[PDB]
Design a protein around this ligand. Structure first.
Ligand SMILES: [Zn+2]
Ligand SMILES: [Zn+2]
Length: 883
């Protein structure tokens, strides 16, 4: 029929050697060796093109067929070379990149090409089911080649059927891949759409002679049949006669580093922080400089200096656990788990999106409601207990050796560990200086340090997951914090006794009893919806509400505490690690006046507090106390305190919140759609439409809280206990990981023990965790001491970190100290303790009944004896496996 069709049939008639001769003949290419080495190495700061695509778009823009700007959207990014080139162009502002990825060779790559700070990529996106969005520039490289023109047509048509929905929303420019433009159905539709929306079709010489792929672009106006049949003609004429020589061109150099952006941050009160700033400058005045290409939007850029790189991403294996769990080598849910990327890159590529936000300033009515509820809560909390200053001796009483130092200034760089510094009165002399300055109204040293947290998390793109930001101040400042507001934690102000809704310090054993007590309480359903990135969502007004406690202190206590709040919380100065161009790395200093840090002493206290305030507010809105106008301004504010004193405790005891996480039990289902105040404050719901009603639950056993759902188990003798559970795969993955670089096998086995006894203590009800844990404790010498860190939760006291035997500890925590258990009868043997229900065990991630688990379980003894051999013989093992 058409020129393209006959050319295609002829191409398929060919054999392998003619295929070879033709496919490359006389096209243009780029020297890809320079890049393809850096890809194998992973040299991010090389600034090379991750795919060929970058050269394609480059040729498209240099000739002038595409004029991109503003909000750019890449469809089918793949590695992402399109997006990465997009970043470079003068007029672009935001680059989002979407592709399918996953199984098969089809994933993305993360590098440090110029302007990477505006490149937000994502995987696992069937864009056909994705609703469109209003771009300024639309890009699409989608279209799988094939032999059958039926396919090329079918697909390319489907692609267009998708992209139409987007294009109708008016992009300033566009480029779309068209695999088959040479068929009659194709030619017709392409002419119709060229008329209806514009642009024109251009064939690129970079593309190989083995496909008819053409690109539909904004800046052109050529007729379909013209360029299409010109391309077909050139392809045919290239087929016959001479194999013409490939032409070599230089691949584009993207550069490296960050790009400048619109600084929308509030101006800092230089009187407060200027001392710290100019002190830091005066200390690092040798290499101090100001980069114009700061990547910060919502923080005040205060400067940078040259520094060395900290942390890494590499993830090591605990061969103990892995060799004791070969059947789990298949599950992605465990293998994909790895370390967090704590490099400056891995930090900043989370910072720029999660942390670089400025919360919507809530309205004056919501402000008034917040301050009222916060005042009432400070009243009802400080009734029984009163504030007090904490003493040095309490600080050194609580302190341990492992705590973080925080080397900032030259005067602070003497000591090595905490236990050393605390015993040197020079330390306390500097503390007395910063205290005298604080009382005088100046701050010289309370500066925040920040880096990426060493966590065990699900890997993304088959690669290291990014590290969330953690920031804390140096020891002395933490002491000032402790003596000022140290007590709220110490006296257990958030304890269920005093608070009612809080659960400060209570372990994972108990919390399910709180959920049972809450379920016996009548009403509607249970709602536990996670608040997205709580730390960033804390606003000025919330901090001013939390500072209201100062009215219950005394003159000195109020002076020190309020001073610390003002010069520490309400104005924050941070030191952060950023990777610079050409491989070097630098330290930036920034500031802001909002949100909260993970390393603030009263993190849990303030978080739990303001979270309770939020839940109270939403309970008022749900029960028709707050009308829709009262966001703008409050009507008849007294009917707030009328409700608070009528049912406050009555509703507060219907709460179980812990820092960021929350559990609520309201009177009726209106709580599911009382989102207006919640949203106005800026406390959005994670992974849910902002305006869609919340998911509730009937059966309390299924409630997720602090990552765990709590199940009730009856003992074989008759008594009932409440146990925490979650998905097996996450725990097995966590055990697999080894945190340190270059650790001797001893300490890794120590970690394996720690995890084993953790599972025995808590997740005994899980057949695979009990089995595997007994296998670890068996294969590990019972001599050795458990070391390391297993979970970062505060509700794990660390009861498994001892040489004791776990039956006795189990009896202590689950029977002897169990407040909700009346009969104190200890249990004699392991097999009296029941497992979880077989169906529920299967659901929570168990592999019982499958043949790899049966094989591994029946040959457990051979493998464990192999572990004993590998460690080393003539060491004392105990054979825990009796059954
Ligand atoms: Zn200070
Ligand atoms: Zn479960």
């Amino acid at each position: 029929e058409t020129l393209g069709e006959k050319w295609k049939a002829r191409l398929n008639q060919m054999s392998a050697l003619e295929f070879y001769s033709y496919k490359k003949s006389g096209i243009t290419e780029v020297c890809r060796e320079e890049a393809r080495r850096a890809l194998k190495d992973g040299v991010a700061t090389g600034g090379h093109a991750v795919s060929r695509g970058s050269a394609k778009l480059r040729w498209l823009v240099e000739r002038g067929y595409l004029q991109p700007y503003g909000k750019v959207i890449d469809l089918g990014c793949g590695r992402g070379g399109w997006s990465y080139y997009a970043a470079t162009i003068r007029k672009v502002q935001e680059v989002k990149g979407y592709t399918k990825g996953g199984p098969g060779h089809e994933e993305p790559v993360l590098v440090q090409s110029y302007g990477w700070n505006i490149v937000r990529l994502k995987s696992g996106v069937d864009v056909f089911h994705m609703a469109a969005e209003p771009c300024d520039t639309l890009l699409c490289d989608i279209g799988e080649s094939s032999s059958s023109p039926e396919v090329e047509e079918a697909r390319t048509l489907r692609v267009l059927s998708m992209v139409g929905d987007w294009l109708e929303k008016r992009p300033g420019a566009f480029c779309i891949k068209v695999l088959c433009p040479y068929t009659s159905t194709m030619m017709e539709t392409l002419e119709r759409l060229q008329r209806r929306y514009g642009g024109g079709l251009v064939r690129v010489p970079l593309s190989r002679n083995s496909t008819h792929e053409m690109y539909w672009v904004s800046g052109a106006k050529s007729n379909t049949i013209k360029s299409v049949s010109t391309t077909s003609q050139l392809l045919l004429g290239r087929m016959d006669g001479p194999r013409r020589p490939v032409k070599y061109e230089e691949d584009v150099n993207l550069g490296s580093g960050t790009r400048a952006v619109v600084s929308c941050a509030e101006a800092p009160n230089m009187k407060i922080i200027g001392n710290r700033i100019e002190r830091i400058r005066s200390e690092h005045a040798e290499t101090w400089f100001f980069d114009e290409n700061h990547p910060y939007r919502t923080w005040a850029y205060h400067g940078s200096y040259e520094a060395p790189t900290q942390g890494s991403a590499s993830s090591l294996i605990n061969g103990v656990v892995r060799l004791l769990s070969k059947p789990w080598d298949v599950v992605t849910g465990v293998t994909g788990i790895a370390m967090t990327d704590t490099t400056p890159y891995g930090q900043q590529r989370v910072f720029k999106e999660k942390v670089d936000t400025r919360v919507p300033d809530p309205q004056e009515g919501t402000r008034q409601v917040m301050s009222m509820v916060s005042s009432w809560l400070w009243k009802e909390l400080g009734k029984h207990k009163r504030p007090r200053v904490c003493t040095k001796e309490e600080f050194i009483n609580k302190v341990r050796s492992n705590a973080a130092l925080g080397a900032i200034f030259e005067e602070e760089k003497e000591w090595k560990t905490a236990v050393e510094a605390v015993n040197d009165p020079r330390f306390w002399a500097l503390v007395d200086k910063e205290r005298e300055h604080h009382l005088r109204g100046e701050c010289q040293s309370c500066v925040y340090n920040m880096m990426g947290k060493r966590e065990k998390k699900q890997g993304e793109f088959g690669k290291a997951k990014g590290s969330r930001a953690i920031w804390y101040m140096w020891l002395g400042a933490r002491f000032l914090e402790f003596e000022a507001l140290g007590f709220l934690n110490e006296d257990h102000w958030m304890g269920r006794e005093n608070s009612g809704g809080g659960v400060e310090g209570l372990g994972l054993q108990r919390l399910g009893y709180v959920l049972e007590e809450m379920s016996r309480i009548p009403g509607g359903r249970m709602y536990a919806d996670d608040t997205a990135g709580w730390d960033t969502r804390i606003s000025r007004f919330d901090l001013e509400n939390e500072a209201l406690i100062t009215n219950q202190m005394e003159k000195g206590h109020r002076a020190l505490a309020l001073a610390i709040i003002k010069y520490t919380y309400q104005n924050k100065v941070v030191k952060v690690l950023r990777p610079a161009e050409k491989g070097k790395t630098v330290m930036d200093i920034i500031s802001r006046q909002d949100q909260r840090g993970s390393g603030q002493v009263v993190t849990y206290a303030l978080n739990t507090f303001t979270n309770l305030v939020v839940q109270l507010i939403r309970n008022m809105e749900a029960e028709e106390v707050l009308e829709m106008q009262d966001l703008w301004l409050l009507r008849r504010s007294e009917k707030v305190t009328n409700w608070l004193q009528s049912n406050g405790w009555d509703r507060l005891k219907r709460m179980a919140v812990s820092g960021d996480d929350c559990v609520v039990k309201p009177i009726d289902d209106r709580f599911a759609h009382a989102l207006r105040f919640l949203n106005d404050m800026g406390k959005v719901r994670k992974d849910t439409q902002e305006w869609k009603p919340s998911t509730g639950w009937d059966n309390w056993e299924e409630v997720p809280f602090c990552s765990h759902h709590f199940n009730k188990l009856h003992l074989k003798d008759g008594r009932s206990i409440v146990v925490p559970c979650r998905h097996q795969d996450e725990l097995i993955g966590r055990a697999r990981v080894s945190p340190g670089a270059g650790w001797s096998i001893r300490e890794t086995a120590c970690l394996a023990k720690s995890y084993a006894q953790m599972w025995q203590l808590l997740y005994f009800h899980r057949r695979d965790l009990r089995l595997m844990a007994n296998a670890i404790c068996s294969s590990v010498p019972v001599d050795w001491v458990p070391t390391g860190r297993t979970t970062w939760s505060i509700h794990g006291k660390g009861e498994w970190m001892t040489t004791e035997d776990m039956l006795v500890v189990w009896n202590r925590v689950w029977i002897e100290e169990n407040d909700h258990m009346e009969d104190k009868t200890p249990v004699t043997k392991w097999t009296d303790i029941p497992y979880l229900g077989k169906r529920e065990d299967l659901w929570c991630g168990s592999l019982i009944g499958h043949r790899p688990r049966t094989t591994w379980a029946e040959n457990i003894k051979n493998t464990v004896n192999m572990v004993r051999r590998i460690i080393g013989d003539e060491e004392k093992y105990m054979d825990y496996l009796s059954t």
